[PDB]
Design a protein around this ligand. Structure first.
Ligand SMILES: C[C@H](OP(=O)(O)OP(=O)(O)OP(=O)(O)OC[C@H]1O[C@@H](n2cnc3c(=O)[nH]c(N)nc32)[C@H](O)[C@@H]1O)c1ccccc1[N+](=O)[O-]
Ligand SMILES: C[C@H](OP(=O)(O)OP(=O)(O)OP(=O)(O)OC[C@H]1O[C@@H](n2cnc3c(=O)[nH]c(N)nc32)[C@H](O)[C@@H]1O)c1ccccc1[N+](=O)[O-]
Ligand SMILES: [Mg+2]
Ligand SMILES: [Mg+2]
Lengths: 166, 166
């Protein structure tokens, strides 16, 4: 069948594992799983279309220098995730973009912006801010929460749609 | 606040009222409401952003000749809806596109493609077909059902996102 190599990218502790765990095994990872390279692949029906979502949850901290180069060349879609209480995670959602452009030899590659953790009162990255970066980037902006599942499907499915025009 | 004039467009009996009724008043309209010009407007939080969704559900049958011209000039986003069991509704999702381009003096205007009624066994418009029209159009493709609510939010929210880059 059709199938999709989505890489889930972003900083440490922003949520990208709780995102994926939400998508597949249907629960919140309050508890612990301090991980690096993780691969799940699912038989999924997106808009009447049968497809394999093959998703590479990645490691935050840069124990990961040129190893980012590998999978990034083998990623069709990229979910660039950050958190709304960690302004710094936002600031770094640019050098991820820049390294992807590097390895891809391309300046527009399927990508979605995800300001995660939105069920929190501890807001620091306003939407308005985040949104105009998506704008600067030409990539969508979808806010999310792995606590509430809120946003999680919109998030992954949008990216797929991005790949479809590419 | 920010606010969004979404027009919901498409053929007769494809579902565009059951779509909207699903979005707002939270139920399926099995029963009856054979309608023309209908306006609902909602205070909605889309991705941390407060906005007024002002949505014009429209009439199917062309009792509607130049009256389409009016609201179409006052529509930011357009949901172009059809049904998966009515190949003809598909075929006509082009002359809606063409009249919008007409009145807009524009060839790319925020728009989403919605092949509705997907909870049905009576399929006639395959995804593959529909999808490559979205492609031909550069507009997304989202399948939906007002029976199951399935797709309904993805549908409207995507379009908003389309308007945001425009
Ligand atoms: C960097 C390292 O792990 P990492 O893999 O580099 O970074 P992750 O994004 O994978 O971290 P993970 O998503 O597993 O943890 C997210 C943290 O926020 C919480 N969580 C996740 N997303 C949300 C959200 O949407 N809302 C709410 N309310 N809670 C959420 C989790 O309980 C967890 O403490 C890591 C760092 C810090 C904490 C965890 C952690 N980890 O490996 O689990
Ligand atoms: C043209 C005229 O009305 P119209 O306003 O021109 O066209 P509408 O799209 O508004 O028609 P509406 O959406 O109200 O009705 C949809 C029909 O399919 C059913 N329905 C809607 N969408 C779905 C879907 O996702 N799945 C399923 N299983 N059922 C759905 C409804 O019960 C209804 O019979 C009209 C024509 C035929 C029938 C109704 C009708 N109408 O005014 O209600
Ligand atoms: Mg992880
Ligand atoms: Mg109607």
């Amino acid at each position: 069948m059709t199938e999709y190599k989505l890489v889930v990218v972003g900083a440490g502790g922003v949520g990208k594992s709780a995102l994926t765990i939400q998508l597949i095994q249907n629960h919140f990872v309050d508890e612990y799983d301090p991980t690096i390279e993780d691969s799940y692949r699912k038989q999924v029906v997106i808009d009447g279309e049968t497809c394999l979502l093959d998703i590479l949850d990645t490691a935050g901290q840069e124990e990961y220098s040129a190893m980012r180069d590998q999978y990034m060349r083998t990623g069709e879609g990229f979910l660039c995730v950050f958190a709304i209480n960690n302004t710094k995670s936002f600031e770094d959602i640019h050098q991820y973009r820049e390294q992807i452009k590097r390895v891809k030899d391309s300046d527009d590659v399927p990508m979605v912006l995800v300001g995660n953790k939105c069920d929190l009162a501890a807001r620091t990255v306003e939407s308005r801010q985040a949104q105009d970066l998506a704008r600067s980037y030409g990539i969508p902006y979808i806010e999310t929460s792995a606590k509430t599942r809120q946003g999680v499907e919109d998030a992954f499915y949008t990216l797929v749609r991005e790949i479809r025009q590419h």
